[PDB]
Amino acid sequence: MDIKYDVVIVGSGPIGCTYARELVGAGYKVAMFDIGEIDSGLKIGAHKKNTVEYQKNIDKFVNVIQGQLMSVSVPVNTLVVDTLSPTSWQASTFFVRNGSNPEQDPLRNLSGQAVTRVVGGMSTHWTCATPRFDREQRPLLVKDDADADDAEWDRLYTKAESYFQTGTDQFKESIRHNLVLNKLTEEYKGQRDFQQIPLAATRRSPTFVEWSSANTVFDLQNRPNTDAPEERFNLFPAVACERVVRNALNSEIESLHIHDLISGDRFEIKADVYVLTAGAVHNTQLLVNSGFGQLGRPNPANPPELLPSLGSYITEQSLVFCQTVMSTELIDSVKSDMTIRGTPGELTYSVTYTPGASTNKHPDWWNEKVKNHMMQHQEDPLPIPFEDPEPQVTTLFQPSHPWHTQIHRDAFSYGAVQQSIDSRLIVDWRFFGRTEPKEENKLWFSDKITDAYNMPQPTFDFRFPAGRTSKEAEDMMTDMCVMSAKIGGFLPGSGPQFMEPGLVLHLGGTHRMGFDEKEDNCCVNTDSRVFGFKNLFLGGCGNIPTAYGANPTLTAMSLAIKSCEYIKQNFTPSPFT
Amino acid sequence: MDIKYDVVIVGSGPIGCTYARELVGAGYKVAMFDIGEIDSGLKIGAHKKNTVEYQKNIDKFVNVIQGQLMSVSVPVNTLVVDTLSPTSWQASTFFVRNGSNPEQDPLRNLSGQAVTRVVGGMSTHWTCATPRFDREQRPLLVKDDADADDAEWDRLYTKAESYFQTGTDQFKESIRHNLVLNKLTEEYKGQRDFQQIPLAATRRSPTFVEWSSANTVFDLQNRPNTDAPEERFNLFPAVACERVVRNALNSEIESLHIHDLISGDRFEIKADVYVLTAGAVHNTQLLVNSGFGQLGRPNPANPPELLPSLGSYITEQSLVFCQTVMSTELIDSVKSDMTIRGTPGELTYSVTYTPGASTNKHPDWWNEKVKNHMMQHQEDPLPIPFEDPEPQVTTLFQPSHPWHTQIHRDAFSYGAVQQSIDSRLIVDWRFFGRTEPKEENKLWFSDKITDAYNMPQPTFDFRFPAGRTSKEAEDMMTDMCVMSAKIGGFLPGSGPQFMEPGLVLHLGGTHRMGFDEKEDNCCVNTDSRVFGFKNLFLGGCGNIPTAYGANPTLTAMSLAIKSCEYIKQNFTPSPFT
Amino acid sequence: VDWRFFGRTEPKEENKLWFSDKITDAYNMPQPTFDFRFPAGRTSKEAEDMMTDMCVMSAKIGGFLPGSGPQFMEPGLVLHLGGTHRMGFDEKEDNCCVNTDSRV
Amino acid sequence: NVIQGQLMSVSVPVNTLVVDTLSPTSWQASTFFVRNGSNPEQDPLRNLSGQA
Numbered sequence A, B: 001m002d003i004k005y006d007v008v009i010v011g012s013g014p015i016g017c018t019y020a021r022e023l024v025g026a027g028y029k030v031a032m033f034d035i036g037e038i039d040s041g042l043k044i045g046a047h048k049k050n051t052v053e054y055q056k057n058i059d060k061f062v063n064v065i066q067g068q069l070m071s072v073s074v075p076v077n078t079l080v081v082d083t084l085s086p087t088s089w090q091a092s093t094f095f096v097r098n099g100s101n102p103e104q105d106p107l108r109n110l111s112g113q114a115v116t117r118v119v120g121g122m123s124t125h126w127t128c129a130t131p132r133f134d135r136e137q138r139p140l141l142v143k144d145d146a147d148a149d150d151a152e153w154d155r156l157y158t159k160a161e162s163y164f165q166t167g168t169d170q171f172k173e174s175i176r177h178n179l180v181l182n183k184l185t186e187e188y189k190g191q192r193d194f195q196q197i198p199l200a201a202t203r204r205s206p207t208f209v210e211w212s213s214a215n216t217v218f219d220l221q222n223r224p225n226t227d228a229p230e231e232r233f234n235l236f237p238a239v240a241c242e243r244v245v246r247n248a249l250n251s252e253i254e255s256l257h258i259h260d261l262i263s264g265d266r267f268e269i270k271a272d273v274y275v276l277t278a279g280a281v282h283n284t285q286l287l288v289n290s291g292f293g294q295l296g297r298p299n300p301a302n303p304p305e306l307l308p309s310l311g312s313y314i315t316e317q318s319l320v321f322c323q324t325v326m327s328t329e330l331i332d333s334v335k336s337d338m339t340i341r342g343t344p345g346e347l348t349y350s351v352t353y354t355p356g357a358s359t360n361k362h363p364d365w366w367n368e369k370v371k372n373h374m375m376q377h378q379e380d381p382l383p384i385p386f387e388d389p390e391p392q393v394t395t396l397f398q399p400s401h402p403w404h405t406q407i408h409r410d411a412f413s414y415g416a417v418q419q420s421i422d423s424r425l426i427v428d429w430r431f432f433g434r435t436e437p438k439e440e441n442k443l444w445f446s447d448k449i450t451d452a453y454n455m456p457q458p459t460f461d462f463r464f465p466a467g468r469t470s471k472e473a474e475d476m477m478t479d480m481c482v483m484s485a486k487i488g489g490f491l492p493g494s495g496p497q498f499m500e501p502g503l504v505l506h507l508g509g510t511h512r513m514g515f516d517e518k519e520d521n522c523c524v525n526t527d528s529r530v531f532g533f534k535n536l537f538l539g540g541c542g543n544i545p546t547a548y549g550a551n552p553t554l555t556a557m558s559l560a561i562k563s564c565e566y567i568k569q570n571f572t573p574s575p576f577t
Numbered sequence C: 001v002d003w004r005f006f007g008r009t010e011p012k013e014e015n016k017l018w019f020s021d022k023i024t025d026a027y028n029m030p031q032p033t034f035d036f037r038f039p040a041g042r043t044s045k046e047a048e049d050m051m052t053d054m055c056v057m058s059a060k061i062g063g064f065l066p067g068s069g070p071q072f073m074e075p076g077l078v079l080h081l082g083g084t085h086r087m088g089f090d091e092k093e094d095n096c097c098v099n100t101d102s103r104v
Numbered sequence D: 001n002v003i004q005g006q007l008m009s010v011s012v013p014v015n016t017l018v019v020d021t022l023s024p025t026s027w028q029a030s031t032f033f034v035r036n037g038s039n040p041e042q043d044p045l046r047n048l049s050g051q052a
C-alpha cells in the first residue's frame, strides 16, 4: 500500500473486475478497494455455489444468499406485541429501534432492495443469467444510425459474453430441460421462441457446473506475479471508500478518501482515473457524500448544482413468481418409447427400447438414461433419472410479450410439505417486467440518519408508475398463469404472486447514462464519464436509463468495456519502473 | 500429491488440527484430507463470523450456519398435499424421495443432527463456548487415583485452552452482561456461582471480537514455508476418505483409500499413523465402511467381530431454550446513579453522576457509558449504549443443578415482531442436560441406502433414557423458567421449549473411550487408540463415554493432546530432505 | 372480491363411499371411508382450464390479494357431494339406485 | 366461525405428524396409533378430506 496509482476502482463486483481486466491488461497501475472481505475460498471473488457440497445440496444455497443480503431501508416497525409479561420493559411509542430508518415511508419503499459487501459482490451468489437486451430495452450508443448502434452493441456484448463465459449448451442433455423446452416450443409454434437461458457457466462434468462470477472476469490476484510479471494490480479488502474530492472548478477529481476498517487508518489515495463500481445504491451514496446532487429530502425549490438527475428516474423490475408440479401427461411422455413387461421389483421386470427406430419420439441418449433409471431403481415411480439436471428455459423479451422469463430451478426454501413433493417434478417460474423511468421515483440520503458504516442512510421514494408499466405487470402475471399451465399445476403454497418490491435486485437508473446532461436527464455520457469531470467514471446498473425486463449485468458490463476504451484513448499508463 | 506420509489425518476440524499442531510441530511429515473445501477467506479454516459485516449484522449469521448444516437422517415424508391440480403427477404412496432415509423410524430419530463439510469443520461457525467438565461429567484417565486424574485433566485442559485462546474476560465491561450477572449473583447468593461463559475468543476492539476456530489451533498452511521452514504439512481439500484398509490380523491399518472429488481419481495413501477426526457420525461411518462393527440393522444374534460397541451408547444433550425481554426494574436500575433534570431534546436536559461516589450502585466506566448515551441520544428511551456487547453468562454444571447454562445472545432469526422489540432488551437462555449412555441408543448404517457421497446411510435408533436423564431434563426446564423470570418475562413466540433432538449437535459416545474394550464397552483406549490396532487413532466427541451437559469440544481436544503424547513416544518422524 | 370457479367431475365406478365393518363413527354407526381421485381425462383437463380462466378473468377486475392467490381447495370442502345413491331409468343399464320418482 | 362450528369431517386419516420436541418425561407412543377419532381405513391419498 502506497497512495499513488494510475487507476483506482471502488468495488470488486463483476463491473469493477471488467475495468480491472481491461486496464490491468493494458498496462495501468491499478488499485481496487472493497469494503468487504475475501470469503469464497482461494479463487478470490469466485461463485460460492461451486463447492461440491452445494452442487449436491442446492436448496441450502438460499441460506448463503440470505446471509449476505442486507436490506437497504427498513421502515420503523409498528407491530403490536401485547402478550409481554407485565414485568418486561416496554416503550410507549414505536421508537427508532434495530437499525430502522425513520425517513422511510413504508408505503413508498423498495423493501426488498438489499446490498452485499463481499469481495466479488453479488456475483458470488447470483443466478448467472446473461441475456442481451433487444432494442426496446437498450440504451442508444449511436444516434440516428440503428444499424451502427446494433453493430456497436454486438461487439461489446460478444466481448462481455467471453469474459463471463456465457453459453446456451450447459443443460442440453437434461431430460427435464428438454421436456419443458419441447412442450413450450410446441404450444407456442409460430408465436414465440424458446431456448436455454444464456448462462455464465461452464459444465465440467454431468454433475458439476462451474458458475461464473467476478473471478471469471478477473482473477483478483495481486500483480506482478509469475503468470503476469508485467502487470500491476493491488486489491485492498475491508476498505470503505468514503468520498471523492472534487476540485473547486468541478472539472476533476483530486483524490479518494478511504477508511481501512481493520487498521482504522484513513488515507487520501491519488490516481489519474477514478472508477466507481460500488453498486447502484452505493455509487450514489458515495457521490452524494462527495457533494454531488444533494443530501436530505429532495426539494425542487432548491435543485442541486451538480448532477440534478442523480438518484431520480430509478427503476426496479416487477417480478411475478410461482412453482408448478409437472403434469401426468408430461411425465408419461418421458417413457413413451419404452416397452414395459412384468411387474416392478420382481424377477424379470424388463424395460427396453429399440435404438434408431424413427417411431422413437426421443433420442437415444434420453431413452438409455430412462431405461437404466427404471431398470436400476425399480422401486422409484418416476422415469426421470435422479441426477438429471434442472430445466433452464427462456422465451426472451419481445414487444408482444415485454417481459423476461426464467423457467427453471434455482436456490429455494421449501416448506415441509413442498419437501413432500419429488424435486424432479418442480419447475420455478420467474417473469420480470420493465419499469418506466419517472423523475419522481427516487433514492435519497438522510442528512440526519446514518447506516451501519456511518454513511448517510439511503431512503426510497418509489411507486410502480401508472400506465404502461402497471398494465404490463398485470399482463405478465396472466401470461405466467397461462404459460405455466401447459407444464403442470401450481405447487400449493407457491402459487402466482408478486414478489416484494426490489427483491429482484436489478435496481437501475440511479446515475443514468445519456447523450446530454440536461436534455436526457442524466449523470454520465456514453463513456460512463460523469458530466463536467475529466477523470471520473461510474459503472453498473445505475447507468442504465431505459425500462428493462431482462437481467442487466451483461449490459452494464458491455457499457464498462466501452468506458475502458475511452480511458485507454485518453490516459497514459505510468512506465513500469 | 505423493503417497507416503508419517501421519495422515482425516478431517480438518479443531480436533484434526490439534493433532496437526502437535505432530507437525514435533517434526512429522503430515497430510490432512477434508471432503469439504476452503471457503472462510485467506485464513484457512477461520471463523466465518470474523468479518466486519457479521460483527455489524450478527443476526444474518444464522443463515451461514444453516447453509452448512446438512441433516444426517431424514425419515420418509408423509405430509399429505391434496390441493394439487388434477393434471399434476401424483404418486399413490409416500415413496422414498428427496434424499430421505426409509430405514429411519421417525419416532426414534435425532432429527436435528446435522454435519458440516468444509475446511475447519463446524469451528467455522460454532459459538466458541469452552468449559471444562467437572468430575461427574468427565471420563477417567487415571484409575484409582482421583488426584492424579485431576492433575492430568488440568494439565490437558490448560494446553487446550491455550490452543483455542479461551478466556473469561472478553465481555467484562458490557453493561448488559454485568446487569444480568450481578442480578443472578444476587438472587442465587450462597447457592450458585455465576461467571462469564469461557469463550475461545480474543477481543480486538470495543466492536470486534475475533472468535477462535480450527485456524487458531493450526493455521493450515502447507509447509515447508517461510515462517516454518523445517515443518512438513499438506492439506488436501475436496477429498473423500472412504476406507481404512485393515490387515488380515486386524492389528494394523495398511492404507487410506481416498477419492478426489474434483479430478474423480482414487488413490491409496500410506502412513505410519492414521488419525480419524471426521466427526462423531463420519468417523463411525468410515470405520463401518472399513469393516469395523457391522453394516445393517443391528442384531445381537450376530454381534460383530470388531468393535462390537461401535455406534452404541450414543448420547445427545437435551436442550431447552427461551428468550426474555428485560424487566423494567433492571432497565431502570442501569441509570440508578444518574441525576436527570430538564427535558430531553432541549437545552435544559442534564444527565449527571458523581464519579467515585460510594453510594453509586455502579462503577464509573458504566456510568460514563450510560451518561454519554443518554446525553448524546436524547430521543432514545433506553439507558443502554447502542453498541453495548451482549451478555455472556453462565452458572456451570453442578450436582444440585446438573445442566450447563448459557445466558447470552448468539445468531438468531427474529420473526417480524421479535424485530419489534429492541434488541438491547433481549436475552437467549440455553440449558443443556446430560444423557445417560445406553446400549440400545445406536447410530447404524444401511446396507442398501446410500448418502450423497455414496456411502452407507446413517440411521439413528435413539430415545432419551427413562429415569434420571428424563427426570433431569424436566427439572432443567423448570429451572430455566424460574431463573429467567428474575431477568424479565418471555418474549412471545420464544417461550420455553425443548429444541429438536440433536439440533444441539453435541453427539457423543459413537466410538467411546475406556480402559478395557469388553469391561467398559468401548472402542478406543485412553490414548484414543483403537483396540487391537497399533496405528489407528480416533479423535472427537465420539470418544467421550460419559453423560455430559457442558459443551464438549475442549474435552475432546484434551483427549487429542494426550493421544498425541502417546504418538510422539511411539512413532519416529521421517528425516527431512 | 372473492372468486370461486366450480368444475364438473365425471362419474366413475371406482370412485366410492364405503363403510367400515369394524370402525364406527361418533354415533356408533359404520365409519364412512372414501376411495376417490379426480378422473383422468376431461375432468382433470377442465379443472386446469378452469384455473387459467379464473386467472385471466380475475385480472380484468384487479390483482390478487396476497395470501389468497389462485389455488385449488381441499377436495370436498365444496360440499356438493353427489351420485352416492344415483338416479337413472334402469338399475342395471344406468348403474343406479333410484328411478326418476326417486323410488328405490 | 358459525359455519366451521357445525361442520364435522366425515373421514380423517390416522395422523402421522412427528412431534419430537416433547419433554422426555411426557408419555409418547411408539407408533402412529388410531387416536382422536381418526379412520384407520382411510388412505390419506384417496380421500375427500374437506368433506363434512
Ligand SMILES: *Cc1cc2c(cc1C)nc1c(=O)[nH]c(=O)nc-1n2C[C@H](O)[C@H](O)[C@H](O)COP(=O)(O)OP(=O)(O)OC[C@H]1O[C@@H](n2cnc3c(N)ncnc32)[C@H](O)[C@@H]1O
Binding pocket: A010, A011, A012, A013, A014, A015, A016, A033, A034, A035, A036, A065, A116, A117, A118, A119, A120, A121, A122, A123, A125, A126, A127, A128, A129, A130, A239, A240, A241, A242, A277, A278, A279, A280, A282, A286, A505, A539, A540, A541, A551, A552, A553, A554
Ligand atoms: C443477489 C442476486 C443477484 C443477482 C442474481 C440473483 C441473486 C439472488 N441473479 C442475477 C442473474 O441471473 N443475472 C444478472 O444479470 N444479475 C443477477 N444478479 C445481480 C448481479 O449480481 C449484480 O447485478 C451484479 O453483481 C452487479 O455488479 P456490480 O459489480 O455493479 O455490483 P456488486 O456486485 O453489487 O458489487 C459492488 C461492490 O462494491 C462494494 N462496495 C459497496 N460500497 C462500497 C464502498 N463505499 N467502498 C468500497 N466498496 C464498496 C461491495 O462490497 C461490492 O462487492
Ligand SMILES: *Cc1cc2c(cc1C)nc1c(=O)[nH]c(=O)nc-1n2C[C@H](O)[C@H](O)[C@H](O)COP(=O)(O)OP(=O)(O)OC[C@H]1O[C@@H](n2cnc3c(N)ncnc32)[C@H](O)[C@@H]1O
Binding pocket: B010, B011, B012, B013, B014, B015, B016, B033, B034, B035, B036, B065, B116, B117, B118, B119, B120, B121, B122, B123, B125, B126, B127, B128, B129, B130, B239, B240, B241, B242, B277, B278, B279, B280, B282, B286, B505, B539, B540, B541, B551, B552, B553, B554
Ligand atoms: C454447528 C455449531 C457447532 C457448535 C456450536 C454451535 C453451532 C451452531 N457451539 C459450540 C460451542 O459453543 N462449544 C462447543 O464445544 N462446540 C460447539 N459446537 C460443536 C463443535 O463445533 C464441534 O464439536 C467441533 O467442531 C468438533 O470438531 P471435530 O474436529 O471433531 O469435527 P468437525 O468440526 O465436525 O470436523 C470434521 C470434518 O471432517 C470432515 N469429513 C467428514 N467426513 C469426511 C470424510 N469421509 N473424509 C474426509 N473428511 C471428512 C468434514 O468436512 C469436517 O470438516
